[PDB]
From a paper:
Like other flaviviruses, the tick-borne encephalitis virus (TBEV) envelope protein (E) is composed of three structural domains. To gain insights into the mechanism of neutralization by human anti-TBEV antibodies, we solved crystal structures of the antigen-binding fragment (Fab) from the broad and potent antibody T025 (IGVH3–30/IGVK3–15) in complex with the EDIII domains of all three subtypes of TBEV. The broad and potent anti-TBEV antibody T025 recognizes a lateral ridge epitope on EDIII that is also targeted by antibodies raised against other flaviviruses.
The structure of the T025 Fab–TBEVWE EDIII complex revealed that the antibody binds the lateral ridge of EDIII in the proximity of the EDI–EDIII hinge region, making both heavy chain (HC) and light chain (LC) contacts to the EDI–EDIII hinge and the BC loop and light chain contacts to the DE loop of the EDIII. The antibody contacts EDIII using CDRH2, CDRH3, CDRL1, and CDRL3, and buries 598 Å2 of surface area on the EDIII (333 Å2 by the VH and 265 Å2 by the VL). T025 inserts Asp100HC and Trp94LC into a cleft in the EDIII, making a salt bridge (Asp100HC–Lys311EDIII) and hydrogen bonds to the EDIII. We compared the T025 Fab–TBEVWE structure to a 3.9 Å cryo-EM structure of a mouse monoclonal antibody (19/1786) bound to the TBEV virion. T025 and 19/1786 are related by <65% amino acid sequence identity in the VHVL and 47% in the CDRs, but structural alignment of the structures by the Cα atoms of the EDIIIs shows that the two antibodies recognize similar epitopes and adopt similar poses. We can therefore use the lower-resolution cryo-EM structure to deduce details about how T025 binds to and neutralizes the virus. This, taken together with the relatively low buried surface area on the EDIII by T025, suggests that T025 also contacts neighboring domains on a native virion.
Residue numbers in the entry:
A (entry chain H): 1 to 52, 52A, 53 to 82, 82A, 82B, 82C, 83 to 100, 100A, ...
B (entry chain E): 303 to 396
C (entry chain L): 1 to 213
Write the structure that this text describes.
């Protein structure tokens, strides 16, 4: 029943502005406080702002006071976060969070989050290169794909269109000095399988509309 | 500058009572996030839209350590005092 | 504001054992303390509110207690889905504040990595850059050291590393490291080697190839 869908995330250049929204359903939105919480990549949870059930009360974390504005439309069951003067350190997954009461925490339900990337880099689809299996990679051969120089996050990878899941490792991207990400995805397979089964990594980069399938051959 | 206290988290510490000096006094306990401004109002029975609580304590708050006292005047007749969702009937003499 | 501290930062326990997580407040937050669970790549979930009350659909092996400045969360008989990051949050005083989290990971025996090395592809090489990838597969514990050597010279500042979440099946970690040279520099050298130090290896393990060979 209770659902919180965020949207509005994306790339924004430093100093500029973004508005997030969160559409609520499955509960009487107008009876409950709503909060925004954010989480930078790999860091802890970070409270941002609150708005009371009736919009009369708002409070902000100190790191965003005077730059963010929280608001809500109770006839549209929608929560908003207007973010001005964005800084690189504002980059995070932003969650809307429901209160079980009129304003206070705790947070009984959470959205899936929306990714805000504050950066000057241009969107770019990844180049996908094969990590070929060799002797240099007993009964086991490793192979994979190197997903290089894309922006922004995220990218998804599958092997044989989702049919090869066992033994697959898709690693967290690293941010290179260029401001672009790279990631690798590897599979361990029986080394006798190289001579019979095809291995093809599927790389999808929704932000740049890139879709790539590299075949990885010995 | 304070948010309004979460209206679900009040109980009576001292219920509405006559102060002697022509006012109504009361104490509340608040179990939520502090500090905050106490939402307080009252209505004449059958007149739910018109607040009639005349506050002598005009800005009652729960502080980090104290607060909870409210003083008001009310019109004659059957009234209901609300502190958040917490209520108490108060009949007022003429 | 209130500073919330959690201890320890990481807790390794075997399945079926009990995990006790601590949460400290710089000043009293009465009983207005909540606990959250967050699994890799997912939104957090409320576990405990009011210091000791279980949220709905939370199983009984989760219990919590405390008031004032010290709170504990206890997980009895850890099940594989219980392994995640746990955050406390005080909400006695605005602004509500999260602690920094405690990672609960599965403890297992020491497992040495399998090391594989990947030369740059010919497609990347015609683009003017060369990436050499070293893979450390299925090791425990998480700490591992990878050194890049190019014609036996230790490399510095030209590599980046990444580590997966704990594998739910065998409780191991995997690590990928990329060494990036320009095509010109890559063609000036011959031996490219990845040297792996880890607790399950009697001595460091080197995997290498010869460019062209
Ligand atoms: Na409150
Ligand atoms: Na926080």
């Amino acid at each position: 029943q209770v659902q919180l869908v965020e949207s509005g995330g994306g790339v924004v250049q430093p100093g500029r502005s973004l508005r997030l929204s969160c559409a609520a359903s499955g509960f009487t939105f107008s009876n409950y406080g709503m909060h925004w919480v954010r989480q930078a990549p790999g860091k802890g949870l970070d409270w941002v702002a609150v708005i009371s059930y009736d919009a009369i009360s708002k409070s902000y974390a100190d790191s965003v006071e005077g730059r963010f504005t929280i608001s809500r439309d109770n006839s549209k069951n929608t929560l908003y976060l207007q973010m001005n003067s964005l800084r690189a350190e504002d980059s995070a997954v932003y969650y809307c969070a429901k209160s079980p009461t009129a304003i206070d925490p705790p947070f009984d339900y959470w959205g899936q989050g929306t990714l805000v990337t504050v950066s000057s880099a241009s969107t770019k689809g990844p180049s996908v290169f094969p990590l070929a299996p060799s002797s240099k990679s007993g009964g086991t051969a490793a192979l994979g794909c190197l997903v290089k120089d894309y922006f922004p996050e995220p990218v998804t990878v599958s092997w044989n269109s989702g049919a090869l899941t066992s033994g697959v490792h898709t690693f967290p991207a690293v941010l290179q000095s260029s401001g672009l990400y790279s990631l690798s995805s590897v599979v361990t397979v029986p080394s006798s399988s190289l001579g019979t089964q095809t291995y093809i990594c599927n790389v999808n980069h929704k932000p740049s509309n890139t879709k790539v399938d590299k075949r990885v051959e010995p | 500058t304070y948010t309004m206290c979460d209206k679900t988290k009040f109980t009576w510490k001292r219920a509405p009572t006559d102060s002697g000096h022509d006012t109504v006094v009361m104490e509340v306990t608040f179990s939520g996030t502090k500090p905050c401004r106490i939402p307080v109002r009252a209505v004449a029975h059958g007149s739910p839209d018109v607040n009639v609580a005349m506050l002598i304590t005009p800005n009652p708050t729960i502080e980090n350590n104290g607060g909870g006292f409210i003083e008001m005047q009310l019109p004659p007749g059957d009234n209901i005092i609300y502190v958040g969702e917490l209520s108490h009937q108060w009949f007022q003499k003429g | 504001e209130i500073v919330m501290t959690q201890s320890p930062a990481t807790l390794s326990v075997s399945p079926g054992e009990r995990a006790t997580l601590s949460c400290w407040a710089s000043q009293s937050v009465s009983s207005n303390l909540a606990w959250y669970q967050q699994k890799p790549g997912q939104a957090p979930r409320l576990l405990i509110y009011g210091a000791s009350t279980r949220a709905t659909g939370i199983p009984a092996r989760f219990s919590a207690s405390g008031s004032g400045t010290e709170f504990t969360l206890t997980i009895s008989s850890l099940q594989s889905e219980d392994f995640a990051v746990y955050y406390c949050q005080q909400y006695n005083n605005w602004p509500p504040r999260f602690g920094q989290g405690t990672k609960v990971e599965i403890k297992r025996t020491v497992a040495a990595p399998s090391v594989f090395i990947f030369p740059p592809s010919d497609e990347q090489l015609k683009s003017g850059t060369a990436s050499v990838v070293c893979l450390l597969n299925n090791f425990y514990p998480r700490e591992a050291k990878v050194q890049w050597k190019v014609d036996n010279a230790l490399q510095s500042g030209n590599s980046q590393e990444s580590v997966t979440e704990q594998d739910s099946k065998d409780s191991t970690y995997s690590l990928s490291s990329t060494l990036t040279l320009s095509k010109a520099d890559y063609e000036k050298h011959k031996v490219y080697a990845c040297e792996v130090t880890h607790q399950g290896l009697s001595s460091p393990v080197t995997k290498s190839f010869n460019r062209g060979e």
